[PDB]
Amino acid sequence: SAKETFYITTPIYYPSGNLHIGHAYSTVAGDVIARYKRMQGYDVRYLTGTDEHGQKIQEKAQKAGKTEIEYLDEMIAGIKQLWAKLEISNDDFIRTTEERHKHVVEQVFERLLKQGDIYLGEYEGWYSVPDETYYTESQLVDPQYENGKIIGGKSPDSGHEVELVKEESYFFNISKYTDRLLEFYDQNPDFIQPPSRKNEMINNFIKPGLADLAVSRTSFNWGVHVPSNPKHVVYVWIDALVNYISALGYLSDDESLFNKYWPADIHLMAKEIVRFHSIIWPILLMALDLPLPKKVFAHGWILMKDGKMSKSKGNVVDPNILIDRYGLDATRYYLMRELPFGSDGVFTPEAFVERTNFDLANDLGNLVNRTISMVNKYFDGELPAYQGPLHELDEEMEAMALETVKSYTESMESLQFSVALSTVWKFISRTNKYIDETTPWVLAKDDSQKDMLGNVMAHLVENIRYAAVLLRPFLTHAPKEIFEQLNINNPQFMEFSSLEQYGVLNESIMVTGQPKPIFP
Ligand SMILES: CNC(=O)c1ccc2c(c1)nc(-c1ccc(Br)c(O)c1)n2[C@@H](CNC(=O)COc1ccccc1C(C)(C)C)c1ccc(OC)c(OC)c1
């Protein structure tokens, strides 16, 4: 009786200032899924947010001569400005400084304490002061021993000697849920995407035994405090992970969003945090007796020919610069086209320009401009109504249009965005080829071939309309501009349902008398 719901999330971003195209990819990709699911008729909720706690945030605020909230408000303003600039269709933005989040972190922690899933112990970690990163005994390089116990070592990055750090900490005993998690994987084979990551998780993390998780610290203050032991602050594991249910008003005075949208249909994230969403998150939800998420999707990185982009190498590509210089459509298209499923992508300015110029401006932009120009020149702007596949090429081309939609659909549902886009561009290329094959200018000579000329123009515009509709989730400007210039005004003709049967324009239409570039 009601629309089926679809809840999609990106990870909450840690506001350390440097937002590169790698961070933009997650929110753009999430936006594409969100827009696609809305067009399919789902009741969609798309969430993003920020991780605002931890020692480092408060150190950075204090160093800058600001309060924690002053500092964070400025950083979050910048992040939300970028999302608005990328036209991210997120329905909400969760900040971990909000009471709706803090209340959940406190209540979840207290519940696990009362159930006995969390117990007090002592955290022991290997810390590198230069790198400010902790490690387990297992990953120290050139470890030193004494009586069989690891006594120290070298950071597996910097190469500086690590320091043994100890502090009182609450532990979450996750190992007892091991069997339940493996059974969950068995009954939900599509849970982890790409599917190759599942056995890597099992082998590297679950098979060797899940260590108790240190979920609190006593060494810093900026964060959620444990109500029944206020010297303890909740660490990132529970604090960050419950953002996905705290955003829905879980345990608030109004849980209606939580009742409607939980569980999440897809958690989208970069591959380096999929182990936390694949193991810790499901086990935490089991401990709270909540339904698990249906799917976790890990995407690859957008590299340079220096390696991972970072502020430290001066490697960072700024999405603001790309948008200001080349436009939004070009930026979103490049991100979604160049990062294939289960692999990494590689950014170069030359590759960006080729995609932008060859695919968008040339293939799609000139197809629209050539078509509109021919309709203005041969029929004074009045596009003859579609009649049927009159030309010998039409039967196979009309079939290709439907095969394009079908292929696009199975690519999108399998999260293969780059293949969906390449499939659409094969159709755009074929439409340009249709012009060369039919030579409209030759047909415009003979007065006998005026119906055949009208048929060709009708097939050009119907091919364009198919392309425009399929690109609606990816490009936020181009499709609107194409519909505008073609003077296709009817909202129904911009939806997926209007692609079921080829040739919906069975009435004459007057196209723009002043066509302009679709891009930039
Ligand atoms: C010099 N150091 C850094 O540049 C530095 C970099 C990251 C820092 C960080 C400092 N201090 C914090 C921090 C610490 C305490 C609290 Br409470 C908190 O709040 C955040 N973080 C956070 C940043 N937060 C994240 O990346 C958010 O991750 C998630 C998002 C959604 C859901 C789940 C997650 C998890 C955390 C499960 C991946 C952090 C701490 C430890 C981590 O692994 C050991 C980690 O893995 C990606 C992320």
Residue numbers in the entry: 1 to 520
Task: Give the authors' words.
Methionyl-tRNA synthetase (MetRS) charges tRNAMet with l-methionine (L-Met) to decode the ATG codon for protein translation, making it indispensable for all cellular lives. Many gram-positive bacteria use a type 1 MetRS (MetRS1), which is considered a promising antimicrobial drug target due to its low sequence identity with human cytosolic MetRS (HcMetRS, which belongs to MetRS2). The CP domain of SaMetRS contains one single knuckle that lies on the top of the catalytic core, characterizing SaMetRS as MetRS1.
Recently, a series of phenylbenzimidazole inhibitors against SaMetRS were identified through DNA encoded library technology (DELT), and these inhibitors exhibited potent enzyme inhibition and moderate antibacterial activities. P80 inhibited the pretransfer editing activity of SaMetRS with IC50 = 94.6 ± 6.7 nM. We determined the crystal structure of SaMetRS with P80 at 1.92 Å resolution. As shown in its cocrystal structure with SaMetRS, the four branches of P80 stretched in different directions to interact with SaMetRS. As the first branch, the tert-butylbenzene segment lies on the L-Met binding site and forms extensive hydrophobic interactions with residues Pro11, Trp237, Ala240, Leu241, Tyr244, Ile273 and Phe276. Binding of this moiety to the L-Met site did not induce the Trp237 flip like what L-Met did, and maintained an open L-Met site, as observed in F- and A-state SaMetRS. As the third branch, the bromobenzene moiety of P80 stretched deeply into the auxiliary pocket formed by residues Asp51, His54, Gly55, Glu55, Lys56, Ile57, Thr96 and Asp239 from AD and residues Val224 and Val234 from the CP domain.
